[PDB]
Short mmCIF file of C-alpha atoms in Angstrom, two decimals:
data_model
loop_
_atom_site.label_atom_id
_atom_site.label_comp_id
_atom_site.label_asym_id
_atom_site.label_seq_id
_atom_site.Cartn_x
_atom_site.Cartn_y
_atom_site.Cartn_z
CA UNK A 1342 168.22 68.43 99.89
CA UNK A 1343 171.66 69.67 98.79
CA UNK A 1344 170.79 73.24 99.79
CA UNK A 1345 169.34 72.07 103.11
CA UNK A 1346 172.45 70.07 104.03
CA UNK A 1347 174.92 72.88 103.28
CA UNK A 1348 172.81 75.45 105.15
CA UNK A 1349 172.63 73.06 108.11
CA UNK A 1350 176.41 72.62 108.01
CA UNK A 1351 176.98 76.38 107.63
CA UNK A 1352 175.67 76.85 111.18
CA UNK A 1353 178.88 75.28 112.56
CA UNK A 1354 177.48 74.59 116.03
CA UNK A 1355 178.00 71.69 118.42
CA UNK A 1356 174.27 70.95 118.59
CA UNK A 1357 173.93 71.42 114.81
CA UNK A 1358 175.46 68.22 113.45
CA UNK A 1359 174.71 65.86 110.58
CA UNK A 1360 173.32 63.24 112.97
CA UNK A 1361 170.98 65.94 114.34
CA UNK A 1362 169.49 66.69 110.91
CA UNK A 1363 165.67 66.34 110.99
CA UNK A 1364 165.37 63.17 108.89
CA UNK A 1365 161.80 62.75 110.18
CA UNK A 1366 160.70 65.10 107.40
CA UNK A 1367 161.73 62.40 104.93
CA UNK A 1368 159.89 59.09 104.82
CA UNK A 1369 163.07 57.30 105.95
CA UNK A 1370 162.36 55.50 109.22
CA UNK A 1371 165.73 55.91 110.95
CA UNK A 1372 169.07 57.66 110.54
CA UNK A 1373 170.56 54.58 108.86
CA UNK A 1374 167.97 54.63 106.06
CA UNK A 1375 168.59 58.35 105.48
CA UNK A 1376 172.33 57.70 105.20
CA UNK A 1377 171.71 54.78 102.83
CA UNK A 1378 169.52 56.88 100.53
CA UNK A 1379 171.41 60.20 100.60
CA UNK A 1380 175.08 59.21 100.94
CA UNK A 1381 175.59 60.54 97.40
CA UNK A 1382 174.91 64.09 98.63
CA UNK A 1383 176.10 63.93 102.24
CA UNK A 1384 179.60 62.60 101.52
CA UNK A 1385 180.80 65.50 99.27
CA UNK A 1386 179.81 68.10 101.88
CA UNK A 1387 181.82 66.32 104.59
CA UNK A 1388 184.84 65.91 102.30
CA UNK A 1389 185.02 69.60 101.38
CA UNK A 1390 184.59 70.50 105.06
CA UNK A 1391 187.44 68.17 106.13
CA UNK A 1392 185.01 65.87 107.97
CA UNK A 1393 186.84 62.75 106.83
CA UNK A 1394 186.44 61.28 110.32
CA UNK A 1395 182.68 61.83 110.03
CA UNK A 1396 182.31 60.06 106.68
CA UNK A 1397 184.51 57.23 107.96
CA UNK A 1398 182.18 57.01 110.96
CA UNK A 1399 179.34 56.94 108.42
CA UNK A 1400 180.95 54.11 106.44
CA UNK A 1401 181.47 51.63 109.27
CA UNK A 1402 177.99 52.19 110.74
CA UNK A 1403 176.20 51.75 107.39
CA UNK A 1404 178.17 48.52 106.69
CA UNK A 1405 179.54 49.54 103.29
CA UNK A 1406 182.97 49.80 101.70
CA UNK A 1407 184.36 53.26 102.47
CA UNK A 1408 186.58 53.14 99.38
CA UNK A 1409 183.58 52.49 97.14
CA UNK A 1410 181.41 55.12 98.85
CA UNK A 1411 184.01 57.87 98.40
CA UNK A 1412 184.76 56.78 94.82
CA UNK A 1413 181.07 56.97 93.85
CA UNK A 1414 180.95 60.64 94.94
CA UNK A 1415 184.06 61.58 92.94
CA UNK A 1416 182.24 63.83 90.40
CA UNK A 1417 180.54 65.81 93.18
CA UNK A 1418 183.73 66.47 95.16
CA UNK A 1419 185.59 67.39 91.96
CA UNK A 1420 183.12 70.16 91.05
CA UNK A 1421 183.95 71.67 94.45
CA UNK A 1422 187.77 71.81 94.39
CA UNK A 1423 188.62 71.84 90.67
CA UNK A 1424 186.64 74.91 89.44
CA UNK A 1425 188.35 77.36 91.82
CA UNK A 1426 191.83 76.89 90.31
CA UNK A 1427 191.16 78.40 86.87
CA UNK A 1428 189.25 81.56 87.88
CA UNK A 1429 191.55 84.45 88.84
CA UNK A 1430 193.68 82.86 91.54
CA UNK A 1431 194.09 85.07 94.63
CA UNK A 1432 192.08 87.86 93.00
CA UNK A 1433 190.28 88.89 96.21
CA UNK A 1434 190.68 88.00 99.87
CA UNK A 1435 187.11 86.75 100.27
CA UNK A 1436 187.23 84.47 97.22
CA UNK A 1437 190.82 83.31 97.82
CA UNK A 1438 189.87 81.23 100.88
CA UNK A 1439 187.93 78.77 98.71
CA UNK A 1440 191.05 78.44 96.56
CA UNK A 1441 193.24 77.81 99.61
CA UNK A 1442 191.01 75.14 101.16
CA UNK A 1443 190.49 73.49 97.77
CA UNK A 1444 194.25 73.21 97.22
CA UNK A 1445 194.82 71.95 100.78
CA UNK A 1446 192.14 69.26 100.43
CA UNK A 1447 193.36 68.22 96.97
CA UNK A 1448 197.01 67.95 98.04
CA UNK A 1449 196.11 65.99 101.18
CA UNK A 1450 193.96 63.45 99.33
CA UNK A 1451 196.81 62.78 96.87
CA UNK A 1452 198.54 60.89 99.68
CA UNK A 1453 199.01 57.12 99.61
CA UNK A 1454 196.29 56.41 102.19
CA UNK A 1455 193.56 58.13 100.16
CA UNK A 1456 192.64 57.79 96.47
CA UNK A 1457 195.86 59.55 95.46
CA UNK A 1458 197.42 56.36 94.08
CA UNK A 1459 194.68 55.83 91.47
CA UNK A 1460 192.88 59.20 91.37
CA UNK A 1461 194.33 59.80 87.90
CA UNK A 1462 192.99 56.45 86.68
CA UNK A 1463 189.52 57.22 88.07
CA UNK A 1464 189.72 60.73 86.60
CA UNK A 1465 190.47 59.36 83.12
CA UNK A 1466 188.19 56.31 83.38
CA UNK A 1467 184.84 58.13 83.68
CA UNK A 1468 185.13 61.75 82.48
CA UNK A 1469 181.49 62.21 81.29
CA UNK A 1470 180.14 62.27 84.86
CA UNK A 1471 182.38 65.11 86.02
CA UNK A 1472 181.63 67.02 82.80
CA UNK A 1473 177.84 66.95 83.23
CA UNK A 1474 178.19 67.93 86.90
CA UNK A 1475 180.28 70.95 85.88
CA UNK A 1476 177.75 71.83 83.16
CA UNK A 1477 174.75 71.57 85.51
CA UNK A 1478 176.29 74.17 87.86
CA UNK A 1479 175.69 76.96 85.32
CA UNK A 1480 174.09 80.11 86.71
CA UNK A 1481 174.20 83.40 84.79
CA UNK A 1482 173.08 86.40 86.93
CA UNK A 1499 167.00 87.32 85.34
CA UNK A 1500 164.61 87.16 88.33
CA UNK A 1501 164.65 83.39 88.80
CA UNK A 1502 165.05 81.12 91.84
CA UNK A 1503 168.62 80.36 92.82
CA UNK A 1504 170.01 76.95 91.75
CA UNK A 1505 171.76 74.40 93.98
CA UNK A 1506 174.37 76.14 96.18
CA UNK A 1507 177.37 75.00 94.06
CA UNK A 1508 177.02 77.03 90.87
CA UNK A 1509 179.48 78.78 88.56
CA UNK A 1510 178.99 81.01 85.50
CA UNK A 1511 179.68 79.96 81.91
CA UNK A 1512 183.10 81.62 81.72
CA UNK A 1513 184.18 79.88 84.93
CA UNK A 1514 182.99 76.58 83.43
CA UNK A 1515 185.01 77.27 80.28
CA UNK A 1516 188.06 78.10 82.41
CA UNK A 1517 187.61 74.84 84.33
CA UNK A 1518 187.45 72.89 81.06
CA UNK A 1519 190.62 74.62 79.87
CA UNK A 1520 192.30 73.76 83.18
CA UNK A 1521 191.30 70.10 82.78
CA UNK A 1522 192.83 70.09 79.30
CA UNK A 1523 195.86 71.92 80.71
CA UNK A 1524 196.38 69.42 83.55
CA UNK A 1525 195.98 66.43 81.21
CA UNK A 1526 199.09 64.31 80.74
CA UNK A 1527 199.29 64.86 76.97
CA UNK A 1528 198.78 68.63 77.50
CA UNK A 1529 196.04 69.44 75.00
CA UNK A 1530 194.43 72.84 74.53
CA UNK A 1531 190.85 71.54 74.22
CA UNK A 1532 188.91 69.25 76.54
CA UNK A 1533 186.91 67.88 73.59
CA UNK A 1534 190.04 66.25 72.14
CA UNK A 1535 190.41 63.74 74.99
CA UNK A 1536 186.63 63.54 75.39
CA UNK A 1537 186.70 62.40 71.74
CA UNK A 1538 188.84 59.36 72.60
CA UNK A 1539 185.63 57.61 73.71
CA UNK A 1540 182.96 58.48 71.11
CA UNK A 1541 180.27 57.11 73.42
CA UNK A 1542 181.08 59.83 75.97
CA UNK A 1543 178.99 62.48 74.19
CA UNK A 1544 176.11 60.00 74.42
CA UNK A 1545 176.42 60.02 78.22
CA UNK A 1546 176.31 63.78 78.85
CA UNK A 1547 173.41 64.43 76.47
CA UNK A 1548 171.18 61.81 78.11
CA UNK A 1549 172.32 62.87 81.59
CA UNK A 1550 171.01 66.37 80.87
CA UNK A 1551 167.89 64.80 79.33
CA UNK A 1552 167.13 62.73 82.45
CA UNK A 1553 167.56 65.79 84.67
CA UNK A 1554 165.26 67.81 82.39
CA UNK A 1555 162.59 65.10 82.31
CA UNK A 1556 162.59 64.23 86.02
CA UNK A 1557 161.71 67.81 87.03
CA UNK A 1558 158.57 69.76 86.16
CA UNK A 1559 159.41 73.24 87.49
CA UNK A 1560 159.45 75.84 84.72
CA UNK A 1561 162.47 77.62 86.23
CA UNK A 1562 164.36 74.37 86.86
CA UNK A 1563 163.65 73.31 83.27
CA UNK A 1564 164.74 76.73 82.01
CA UNK A 1565 168.17 76.48 83.64
CA UNK A 1566 168.56 72.96 82.22
CA UNK A 1567 167.96 74.45 78.78
CA UNK A 1568 170.79 76.89 79.50
CA UNK A 1569 173.25 74.16 80.48
CA UNK A 1570 172.18 72.18 77.42
CA UNK A 1571 172.70 75.26 75.24
CA UNK A 1572 176.22 75.81 76.57
CA UNK A 1573 177.22 72.19 75.94
CA UNK A 1574 175.87 72.21 72.38
CA UNK A 1575 177.50 75.58 71.68
CA UNK A 1576 180.76 74.27 73.14
CA UNK A 1577 180.31 71.07 71.13
CA UNK A 1578 179.87 73.06 67.91
CA UNK A 1579 182.97 75.13 68.75
CA UNK A 1580 185.22 72.14 67.98
CA UNK A 1581 183.53 71.01 64.76
CA UNK A 1582 186.72 71.59 62.74
CA UNK A 1583 188.28 68.22 63.65
CA UNK A 1584 185.04 66.28 64.09
CA UNK A 1585 183.55 64.69 67.20
CA UNK A 1586 185.52 61.44 66.98
CA UNK A 1587 183.24 59.81 64.43
CA UNK A 1588 180.12 60.71 66.43
CA UNK A 1589 179.12 63.97 64.71
CA UNK A 1590 176.30 62.22 62.85
CA UNK A 1591 174.77 60.78 66.03
CA UNK A 1592 175.10 63.93 68.16
CA UNK A 1593 173.61 66.05 65.36
CA UNK A 1594 170.50 63.85 65.19
CA UNK A 1595 170.12 63.72 68.98
CA UNK A 1596 170.28 67.47 69.60
CA UNK A 1597 167.86 68.46 66.82
CA UNK A 1598 165.31 65.80 67.78
CA UNK A 1599 165.63 66.86 71.43
CA UNK A 1600 165.05 70.48 70.40
CA UNK A 1601 162.24 69.40 68.06
CA UNK A 1602 160.59 67.50 70.92
CA UNK A 1603 160.93 70.38 73.40
CA UNK A 1604 159.28 72.62 70.81
CA UNK A 1605 156.45 70.14 70.20
CA UNK A 1606 154.98 70.10 73.72
CA UNK A 1607 154.53 73.46 75.46
CA UNK A 1608 151.86 75.07 77.67
CA UNK A 1609 149.07 76.94 75.92
CA UNK A 1610 149.76 80.00 78.08
CA UNK A 1611 153.31 81.30 77.63
CA UNK A 1612 154.88 83.00 80.65
CA UNK A 1613 158.02 85.13 80.78
CA UNK A 1614 160.18 82.14 81.72
CA UNK A 1615 158.46 79.98 79.09
CA UNK A 1616 159.04 82.61 76.39
CA UNK A 1617 162.73 82.80 77.29
CA UNK A 1618 162.96 79.00 77.18
CA UNK A 1619 161.18 78.88 73.81
CA UNK A 1620 163.40 81.64 72.40
CA UNK A 1621 166.52 79.88 73.72
CA UNK A 1622 165.44 76.62 72.08
CA UNK A 1623 164.80 78.34 68.74
CA UNK A 1624 168.13 80.17 68.90
CA UNK A 1625 169.99 76.92 69.62
CA UNK A 1626 168.14 75.17 66.79
CA UNK A 1627 169.08 78.02 64.45
CA UNK A 1628 172.73 77.89 65.53
CA UNK A 1629 173.11 74.13 65.05
CA UNK A 1630 171.41 74.29 61.65
CA UNK A 1631 173.77 77.03 60.44
CA UNK A 1632 176.85 75.26 61.82
CA UNK A 1633 175.92 71.86 60.36
CA UNK A 1634 175.05 73.27 56.92
CA UNK A 1635 178.23 75.36 56.68
CA UNK A 1636 180.58 72.48 57.55
CA UNK A 1637 178.58 69.48 56.25
CA UNK A 1638 176.56 69.99 53.07
CA UNK A 1639 174.76 66.62 53.28
CA UNK A 1640 174.06 66.85 57.02
CA UNK A 1641 170.45 68.07 56.74
CA UNK A 1642 169.44 65.85 53.80
CA UNK A 1643 167.81 63.37 56.21
CA UNK A 1644 166.41 65.81 58.79
CA UNK A 1645 165.16 68.84 56.83
CA UNK A 1646 161.57 67.60 56.50
CA UNK A 1647 161.03 67.04 60.23
CA UNK A 1648 162.57 70.44 61.03
CA UNK A 1649 160.48 72.29 58.44
CA UNK A 1650 157.33 70.38 59.40
CA UNK A 1651 157.68 71.50 63.02
CA UNK A 1652 158.53 75.11 62.11
CA UNK A 1653 155.42 75.72 59.98
CA UNK A 1654 152.88 75.68 62.87
CA UNK A 1655 155.23 77.91 64.90
CA UNK A 1656 154.47 80.97 62.76
CA UNK A 1657 150.94 81.29 64.20
CA UNK A 1658 152.21 82.62 67.55
CA UNK A 1659 153.55 85.83 69.08
CA UNK A 1660 155.61 88.09 66.84
CA UNK A 1661 158.99 87.79 68.59
CA UNK A 1662 159.11 83.99 68.38
CA UNK A 1663 157.60 84.22 64.89
CA UNK A 1664 160.51 86.36 63.67
CA UNK A 1665 163.06 83.71 64.66
CA UNK A 1666 161.08 80.97 62.91
CA UNK A 1667 160.91 82.92 59.64
CA UNK A 1668 164.64 83.70 59.79
CA UNK A 1669 165.51 80.02 60.18
CA UNK A 1670 163.05 79.05 57.44
CA UNK A 1671 164.58 81.61 55.06
CA UNK A 1672 168.10 80.41 55.85
CA UNK A 1673 167.15 76.76 55.31
CA UNK A 1674 165.22 77.43 52.08
CA UNK A 1675 165.91 80.84 50.52
CA UNK A 1676 169.53 81.27 51.61
#
């Protein structure tokens, strides 16, 4: 639906309007029901296109608080303006126009009439939601269907995280420092990725979700020096059990996308095991048996995935 709405709005014609969208394809009876069910997706597109009069016209016809409706879509609008600041400002003419419109929209909304009075409070209050939205927009350019239209590579995501830490009031160098102020935050992103992975059944959609999960875990392990705000024990158990589960169920026939997903899962499991053992000697004392028990059946498969299993087994046992 997100791709359909943006493509419809990209036409930029008088007859091609949001009210003219063919909602009859959906089971929603009328235009009001479609607005009630998809305001989470429709509002961010109008905001980034400066259709603030349109969304206001949406608010007073749906009989809902416009302040609440715009606040609820804060993570989705943020992943549209914020990422363009930290990636090579004014590098090229074609890419600079997104930077210009993002800055213009951001500066305008900081006014008194809009959320500018308490945008900082909302930004600080619920940071996990904007983080997972930024993570989900990962897309590294092989031979897979394109993701949702808003997508940025891993390095752009890292630059955005650095910019968030840079624009923070206390001026930290790492986003994970302030994300560590609420230890329950890491709980929110991990499940949010888990719900997105479980709700879909497409092999390519699942494969990209394994990529965004891999980046978050790798980024999470990159700040293991200071600890994850007292939550290292819980996050360590959650990620390995999630990886153990994803390994447990798998189709009998392994395709190219499935093999890449399986290899990515094994590589991430190997990385977290090495990182945890190196920094915490007694980390694996309560989870070694379940890891080894799952790895043993994995050796009776294709050679390439077998090689990774033996390497992890040797590191856990021999090394």
